[PDB]
Design a protein around this ligand. Structure first.
Ligand SMILES: CC(C)Cn1c(=O)n(C)c(=O)c2nc[nH]c21
Ligand SMILES: [Mg+2]
Ligand SMILES: [Zn+2]
Length: 311
């Protein structure tokens, strides 16, 4: 029953951020039920003052969260609701604990939270070609970042569904700006785009020319931040990361129409060196308080490498 789930969520009391541990970069969701993750998501919107600043009605926000959750496929090992929820939690932590909140506007924070939660909507698994083959054949080269555009379309449809319009409170101009930031935020989760633009971000930091005051770099930062949250499972405490790596490995090797372990340690070390280390280092420079993400990433590299050499 769906309306029953909505009834329960809407009537439930929302515990504090401290009680939910959502401010911790080390946050984990394994012990939480779907209902509990939904309550954590409400707390994120609430504490970031989005519910107040944009006059969201409780029942609407609840319905929206449940529609979002419902549109991820639980049969997919990694790209599912829990990943999206975790990505948003990391965004929340980076904003609060990481003190990034003060460097952005309310509309940017609103867009980021929604994007984090919506960035992988309807994902069918890295080894699934359905979404791509269901579009205009040579559709891969025309509308590039095909998956991300799909995720955004899904995000937008939910945002416009009756009873789910959490942005109805914004003015038309506020709305167009938010939608634009949300779209860019989601497109940014395409690693191909991350690898294409990260160089500029890194370059701007070396020369100490990074300036969030100019729109170009702010947009570049939001894109880098989204990626940082999207890959944050790589920064978790060793016992947690070991588990999240299992999920990634399952989707990569076992799923796609559904020894393995040995491939995992080297895969995670390669992933960290090639994609993660520089990003979290860069982020730490922008905000000293985001260090734990980097620290966590390093500790995990050490652990996986030790296994790679065989413990
Ligand atoms: C999921 C995949 C597309 C990218 N990706 C990721 O996000 N995390 C967290 C990993 O640990 C990982 N290992 C390989 N690829 C990975
Ligand atoms: Mg994605
Ligand atoms: Zn993702």
């Amino acid at each position: 029953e769906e309306t029953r789930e909505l009834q329960s969520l809407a009537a439930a009391v929302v515990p504090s951020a401290q009680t939910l541990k959502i401010t911790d970069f080390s946050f984990s969701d394994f012990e939480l039920s779907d209902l509990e993750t939904a309550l954590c998501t409400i707390r994120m919107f609430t504490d970031l003052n989005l519910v107040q600043n944009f006059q969201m009605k409780h029942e609407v926000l609840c319905r929206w969260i449940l529609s979002v959750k419902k549109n991820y496929r639980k049969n997919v090992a990694y790209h599912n609701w829990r990943h999206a929820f975790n990505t948003a939690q990391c965004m929340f932590a980076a904003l609060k604990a990481g003190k990034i909140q003060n460097k952005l506007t309310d509309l940017e924070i609103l867009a980021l939270l929604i994007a984090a939660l919506s960035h992988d909507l309807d994902h069918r698994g890295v080894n699934n070609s359905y979404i791509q083959r269901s579009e205009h054949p040579l559709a891969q080269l025309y509308c590039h970042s095909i998956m991300e555009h799909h995720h955004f379309d899904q995000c937008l449809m939910i945002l416009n569904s009756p009873g789910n319009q959490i942005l109805s409170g914004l003015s038309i101009e506020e709305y167009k700006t938010t939608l634009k930031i949300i779209k860019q935020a989601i497109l940014a989760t395409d690693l191909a785009l991350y690898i294409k633009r990260r160089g500029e971000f890194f370059e701007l930091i070396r020369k100490n020319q990074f300036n969030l005051e100019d729109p170009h770099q702010k947009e570049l930062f939001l894109a880098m931040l989204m990626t940082a949250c999207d890959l944050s499972a790589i920064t978790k405490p060793w016992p947690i990361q070991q588990r999240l790596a299992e999920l990634v490995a399952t989707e990569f090797f076992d799923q796609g129409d559904r020894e393995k372990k040995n491939k995992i340690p080297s895969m995670q070390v390669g992933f960290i060196d090639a994609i993660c280390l520089q990003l979290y280092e860069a982020l730490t420079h922008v905000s000293e308080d985001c260090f734990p993400l980097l620290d966590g990433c390093r500790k995990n590299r050490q652990k996986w490498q030790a296994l790679a050499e065989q413990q």
